[PDB]
């Protein structure tokens, strides 16, 4: 029962990896391919973050792997800190 679902998840992951490999081959040799639309739309878009552009969709994020984004900067964060209370 659970084994069938695990195998389905493995096959879906393998298909996603195949699409990622196709995107890598595109970035290396061109290329008119599956991942052209997402990257072409994202390059001209004003969305500095991939979360708002892809809306959390897995294939869109997979096609966009390897490109610079605002989310890659950890120094822009600011952890809220409570100062010492008293003596």
């Amino acid at each position: 029962i659970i084994i069938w679902f695990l195998l389905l998840s493995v096959c879906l992951g393998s298909l996603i990896y195949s699409t990622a490999a196709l995107g890598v081959l595109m970035s290396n040799l061109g290329m008119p391919s599956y991942c052209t639309g997402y990257r072409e739309g994202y390059l001209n878009s004003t969305n500095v973050t991939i979360a708002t552009y892809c809306t959390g969709s897995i294939p869109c994020s997979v096609c966009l792997s390897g490109l610079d984004s605002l989310d890659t900067y950890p120094s822009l964060e600011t952890i809220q800190i409570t100062i010492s209370s008293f003596k």
Binding site: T78, I79, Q80, I81, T82, I83, S85, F86, K87
Partner: protein
Amino acid sequence: FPNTYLEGSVRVVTTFDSEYCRHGTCERSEAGVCVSTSGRWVLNNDYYRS
């Protein structure tokens, strides 16, 4: 942020019995009035009083 009545080189502030917080730093202060000769951040406590 607390209420203020003068801004610039010299500042006067008023506080209540509640904690105030700013960008990345929250602090606890008591009610009162403080006067500073410089535009530095001011709150009513022993640390700033010293």
